[PDB]
Amino acid sequence: TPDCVTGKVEYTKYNDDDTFTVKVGDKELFTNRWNLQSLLLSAQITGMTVTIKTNACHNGGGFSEVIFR
Amino acid sequence: TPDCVTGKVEYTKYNDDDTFTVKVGDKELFTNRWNLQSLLLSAQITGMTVTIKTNACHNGGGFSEVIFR
Amino acid sequence: TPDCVTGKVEYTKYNDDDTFTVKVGDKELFTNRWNLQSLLLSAQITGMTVTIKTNACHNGGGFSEVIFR
Amino acid sequence: TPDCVTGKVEYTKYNDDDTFTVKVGDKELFTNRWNLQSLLLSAQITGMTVTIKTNACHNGGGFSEVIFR
Amino acid sequence: TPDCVTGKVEYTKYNDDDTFTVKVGDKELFTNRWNLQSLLLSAQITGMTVTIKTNACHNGGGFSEVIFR
Numbered sequence: 393t394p395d396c397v398t399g400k401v402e403y404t405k406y407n408d409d410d411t412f413t414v415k416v417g418d419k420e421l422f423t424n425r426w427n428l429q430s431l432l433l434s435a436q437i438t439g440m441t442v443t444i445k446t447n448a449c450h451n452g453g454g455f456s457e458v459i460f461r
Numbered sequence: 462t463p464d465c466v467t468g469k470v471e472y473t474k475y476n477d478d479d480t481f482t483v484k485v486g487d488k489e490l491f492t493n494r495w496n497l498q499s500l501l502l503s504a505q506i507t508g509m510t511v512t513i514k515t516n517a518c519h520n521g522g523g524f525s526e527v528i529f530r
Numbered sequence: 531t532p533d534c535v536t537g538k539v540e541y542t543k544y545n546d547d548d549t550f551t552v553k554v555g556d557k558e559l560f561t562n563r564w565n566l567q568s569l570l571l572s573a574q575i576t577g578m579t580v581t582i583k584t585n586a587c588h589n590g591g592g593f594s595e596v597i598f599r
Numbered sequence: 600t601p602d603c604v605t606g607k608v609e610y611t612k613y614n615d616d617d618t619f620t621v622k623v624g625d626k627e628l629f630t631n632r633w634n635l636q637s638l639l640l641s642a643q644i645t646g647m648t649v650t651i652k653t654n655a656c657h658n659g660g661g662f663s664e665v666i667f668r
Numbered sequence: 669t670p671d672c673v674t675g676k677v678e679y680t681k682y683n684d685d686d687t688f689t690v691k692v693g694d695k696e697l698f699t700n701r702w703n704l705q706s707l708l709l710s711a712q713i714t715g716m717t718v719t720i721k722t723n724a725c726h727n728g729g730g731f732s733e734v735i736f737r
């Protein structure tokens with residue numbers, strides 16, 4: 393799966409459908425993996441850099457693969 | 462769904478019906494989404510700023526959408 | 531529901547019947563709400579002040595409502 | 600149940616039989632309560648002191664009761 | 669179980685099959701124990717040294733035993 397975007401988490405969002413949105417770089421992407429919610433919030437609080445991998449590399453795209461750096 | 466209130470989590474409360482209350486700004490609001498319990502506590506402990514989105518923007522109003530900043 | 535006790539969590543205990551006990555102030559109280567187990571352990575680890583609300587305000591009393599501050 | 604050992608959680612281990620072993624002090628003990636796993640992992644990562652209670656207070660003995668301090 | 673690698677967590681990756689990969693030393697290893705995900709992320713964040721134990725000590729090997737030092 394290609395790199396989609398790399399950077400700090402600017403904000404995260406819990407959505408009404410119970411998915412979890414992240415804003416990294418210039419993209420808003422969401423995931424439906426419940427386990428990623430607390431990992432992504434920790435990344436955000438402590439200021440880690442993340443790399444989101446997905447074929448759906450556009451606003452409102454979904455992802456399931458993340459690299460924390 | 463529109464912004465209701467933005468600020469630090471002043472306290473949280475586990476309720477008898479297994480919902481979870483947060484006080485943000487001058488409002489107490491609650492959510493029935495289990496996943497938000499641990500995120501909201503972490504946001505409180507680490508002192509994040511949250512934005513709660515809901516139309517029920519009054520004491521005792523419910524929400525399911527939150528932005529963590 | 532009236533306040534019973536406010537303070538830091540001195541210790542917590544996992545019991546054989548899969549309930550969870552906390553000692554706050556001079557009271558040991560228990561909850562059978564699984565959701566509170568991880569929330570109370572976090573409050574203990576991070577040094578939060580908790581207020582336990584219950585009508586059974588005596589040693590060995592049960593509760594299901596907590597305020598985290 | 601009597602106190603068996605008090606100390607920090609030195610390490611943890613998922614066994615083939617779906618039980619969970621911890622080493623506290625000079626003892627490896629195991630539990631089959633799933634709920635206790637995540638509490639013990641949290642105790643382990645944050646360096647809490649635990650007291651394990653069991654009357655099979657020897658290597659390979661089981662427990663279902665824990666005090667977290 | 670024999671030691672495989674000891675070192676700092678260089679990065680972690682959440683995978684599409686919901687497993688979690690860590691890079692320690694010169695090895696990428698993964699675990700299917702979801703409870704270990706937040707512990708491994710914390711290790712990465714705080715810069716702890718971990719020892720991973722497995723008898724599959726190759727890139728792409730699986731592990732379930734970790735020691736946090």
Ligand SMILES: [Zn+2]
Pocket residue numbers: 393
């Ligand atoms: Zn791929």
Ligand SMILES: [Zn+2]
Pocket residue numbers: 531532
């Ligand atoms: Zn009440």
Ligand SMILES: [Zn+2]
Pocket residue numbers: 600601
């Ligand atoms: Zn007993």
